[PDB]
Symmetry: none
Subunit: 76 residues, 6 copies
C-alpha cells in the first residue's frame, strides 16, 4: 500500500552570551612527570590507544556556544 | 505501492556572543617530563596509536565559532 | 510502484561574535622533555601512529570563522 | 700451637664387565616435531638457557664403566 | 706454630671391560622438525644460550670406560 | 711459624678394554629440518650463543676410554 513521510523539524532556537570582560588568568601548573613502562604492544583491530600523554591547556573563548548540523536520509 | 518522503528540516537558528575584552592571560607551566619505554609494537588493522605526547596549548578565540553541515541521502 | 524523495533542508541559520579587545597573552612554558624508547615497529594496514611529539601552540583568532558543507547522494 | 694433617686415602678399588655380545639394536623413532614461540629473551647473569632442542641418541659402549673420585683438603 | 700437611692420596685402582662384539646397530629416526620463533635477544653477562638444535648421534665405543679424579689442597 | 706442605698423589691406576669386533652400523636419519626466526641480537659480555645447528654424528672409536686427572694446590 501507499506510504507518506513528512520529516519537518522546524527550528527557530537561539543561543546567546554577554560578558563585560574575560582576563587576569594564570595557568601555572608546578611542572609534572609521566612515566610509562611496558613490553610488547600487540594491537589488532580498530584500537585507538593513547599512552603517556601530558597536556597543559588554557582555553578561553569569548563565546563557547555550539552549532553543528548532521542530516541523513536512507531508503531501501 | 507508491512511497513519498518530504525531508524539510527548516532551520532559522542562531548563535551569538559579545565580549568587552580578552587578555592578561599567563600560561606558564613549570616545564614537564614524559618518558615511555616499550619493546616490539605490533599493530595490524585500523590502529590509531599515539605515544608519549607533551602538549602546552593556549586557545583564546574572540569568537572562534565554526558552522559544519553534513547532508547525506542514500537510495537502493 | 513509484518513489518520490524531496530532500529540501532549508537553512537560514547564522553564527556571529563581537570582541572589544584581544591581547596581552603570555604563553611561557618552562621548557619540556619527551623520551620514547621502543624496539621493532611492525605496522601493516591503515595504522595511523604518532610517537614522541612535543607541541607548544598559541591560537588567538579574533574571528577565526570556518564554514564546512558536505553534500552526498547515492542511488542504486 | 703446632698442627699436623695426614691425608692418606689409599684406594685399590676396581670396576669390571664381561659381555658375550652387544647388538641387533634398532633405534627407530617415528619422527618428531618441536615448536617454540616466544617474544623478547632478556637474560642477564650466568644464564645457561637451552630452547627448542630435539635429540635422538644411540649410545652403545662395550664397557661403559665410570669411576669418579673427588679429593679436597682445606686449612686456614 | 709449625704446620705440616701430607697430602698423600694413593691410587692402584682399575677400570676394565671384555666384549665379544659390538654391531648390527641401526639408528634410523623418521626425520624431525624444529621451529623456534622469538623477537629481540638481549643477553648480557656469562650467558651460555643454545637455540633450536637438532641432533642425531650414534656413539659406539669398543670400551667407552671413564676414570675421573679431582685433587685439591687449599692452605691460608 | 714454619709451614711444610708435601703433595704426593701416587697413582698406578689403569683403564683397559678388549673387543672382538666393531661394525655393521647403519646411522640413517630420515632427513631433518630446523627453522629459527628472531629479531635484534644484542649480546655484550662472555656470551657463548649457538643458534639453529643440525648435527648428524657417528662416533665409533676402537677404545674410546678416558682418564682425567686434575690437580690443584693453593697456598696464601
Amino acid at each position: 500500500g501507499s506510504v507518506q513521510i513528512v520529516y519537518k523539524p522546524v527550528d527557530l532556537s537561539k543561543v546567546t552570551s554577554k560578558c563585560g570582560s574575560l582576563g587576569n588568568i594564570h595557568h601555572k601548573p608546578g611542572g609534572g612527570q609521566v612515566e610509562v613502562k611496558s613490553e610488547k604492544l600487540d594491537f589488532k583491530d580498530r584500537v585507538q590507544s593513547k599512552i603517556g600523554s601530558l597536556d597543559n591547556i588554557t582555553h578561553v573563548p569569548g563565546g563557547g556556544n555550539k552549532k553543528i548540523e548532521t542530516h541523513k536520509l536512507t531508503f531501501r
